[PDB]
């Protein structure tokens, strides 16, 4: 749905979709997101059909020394 | 962007986007080179908007060129 | 590459990729022209064609064939096949393929992709037709459908059975 | 001069080139005329973009029936060449209603007389099925009623009727070049042929567990294949059930009998008594006591 990303969508598949089935514990999408790069996420997140969890690096800014990582752990 | 990508990018949005026959992606495949698929996808539906902004139910190559040539340099 | 892309990307399909691979590749080959083993352009095109044609979106196919650039203003039985294919496809007509098929076999069978894909591809269509014809409910003589489809019941049968 | 296209063409660019609709009333007439030329052109599409822009604004006008009607007539004529009859009559119905207001019933009936006619001309409609009665429909002077009577004929539909009803109705009834372009009535008749047959299948549908192809063709007054088509039609439409057995020349009408049924059927058999024993009961003792005596 962003045309021509096959190699890269394969690259993600190679990064994730395959290693989910078959090892990297994390994969780095590099570039402007929301550009189709975020579409990369959902598109594959759709295709992968593993329970999807997005985060923002902006989700945890809460001023507390405190809760924080808990669900970051528990989620 | 390699042109097959655009070719696929263009063959992505104008697929679902009511167009005017003027709208030519293989015209743009030469017009569009070395850009960002999002913006490219934007230019696609930028023209998706512009004809609608012109109330054109048929999105032109103009509408594209509107999108394109306005977005060739947003400057 | 784009060709070899589609060369994979026809097998696994994703014509859209393959075709677009074929597109810019042929676009190259179109421009590569004489450098390219000459007709290999249109071969890619034929694949590029059949890509869309196995994709079965035939305006572009035509639009391709219509565009003389795409056409390289070059025509062939395979082209005409690809058209007729698409036509027979649009026809969904058992015969029309085999019509086009038999005749155009050269520049048709010659392309293993088509030779592989489209044949079976067409065969599914036939079933799909049969499938549509089997929508009329059962206990019904094959010959009906045979007659309907205009095919040998036997010729129908295995395929018919096959489903 | 006989110039048409360029005539259209010089006029074809108005909405765009010309007014931002600084004055529609002016503009829309050209739009109309363009739409009119679009007919002379034969392309509604010119009209279309025009058309689908304009009318709400006539509605948003201190609404101008003329601007409606004219358009609405174009809108008609659009739909005419189009030949999509719900939609046709749908448009009709719209400013038709406006012309209860605007026209009399009378002069405005033929619209209706054609409207539901179109509705019937359309292979059917669901809204049509609501549009069925309207209210004063069978506008309570003309007939105008055989129209709805056909709409009524639906529930009983037979298709021994067809040539009969054909013969039965064509003052304008089957016989309409009038506001519909059946040049022969086929664009009614043919279109309506199936239409009845089509609907005939519906009541056919309900009335059959099983039937011979013959009894169909008997009632359908059709050849097998026609039937088979109409079969395969609603088969391929899925709109019905059946059995195709030509070897039987018989349609089991296809009860989908695996619903497990006596799931609920017995549950209903329960419900029966749940109704019954419960309904029948609660009054009983109550009854002779309610009287006492």
From Swiss-Prot, chain A:
Q: Where in the cell is it found?
A: Cytoplasm; Nucleus
Tell me how the protein is altered or processed after translation. Answer: N-acetylated by NAT3.
- Annotated positions binding ATP: 31-38
Q: What does this gene product do?
A: The 26S proteasome is involved in the ATP-dependent degradation of ubiquitinated proteins. The regulatory (or ATPase) complex confers ATP dependency and substrate specificity to the 26S complex.
UniProt lists the family membership as follows:
Belongs to the AAA ATPase family.
Q: What is this protein called?
A: 26S proteasome regulatory subunit 6B homolog
From the entire protein, which fragment is shown? 173 to 257 of 428
Swiss-Prot record, chain C:
PTMs per UniProt: N-acetylated by NAT1.
Sorted UniProt keywords: Acetylation, Proteasome
A single MF term (Gene Ontology):
structural molecule activity
S-S pairs: none
Q: Please provide, in alphabetical order, the Gene Ontology terms of the cellular component aspect for this entry.
A: proteasome complex; proteasome regulatory particle, lid subcomplex; proteasome storage granule
**Record note on quaternary structure:** Component of the lid subcomplex of the 19S proteasome regulatory particle complex (also named PA700 complex). The 26S proteasome consists of a 20S proteasome core and two 19S regulatory subunits.
Explain the purpose of this protein: Component of the lid subcomplex of the 26S proteasome, a multiprotein complex involved in the ATP-dependent degradation of ubiquitinated proteins. In the complex, RPN6 is required for proteasome assembly.
Q: What family does this chain come from, according to its entry?
A: Belongs to the proteasome subunit S9 family.
Please report the name of this protein according to its UniProt entry: 26S proteasome regulatory subunit RPN6
From Swiss-Prot, chain D:
Where does the PCI domain lie?
A: 84-258
Q: GO CC terms for this protein?
A: COP9 signalosome; cytoplasm; proteasome complex; proteasome regulatory particle, lid subcomplex; proteasome storage granule
Note the superkingdom of the native organism: Eukaryota
- Spell out the post-translational modification annotation for this entry: N-acetylated by NAT1.
Q: Provide this UniProt record's keywords sorted from A to Z.
A: Acetylation, Proteasome
Q: Where would one find coiled-coil regions in this protein?
A: none
Q: Look up the record and give one Gene Ontology term from the biological process aspect.
A: protein deneddylation
Remaining remarks: Present with 5710 molecules/cell in log phase SD medium.
The UniProt similarity line reads: Belongs to the proteasome subunit p55 family.
Function (record text): Acts as a regulatory subunit of the 26S proteasome which is involved in the ATP-dependent degradation of ubiquitinated proteins.
Q: What is this protein called?
A: 26S proteasome regulatory subunit RPN5
Q: Its encoding gene is what?
A: RPN5
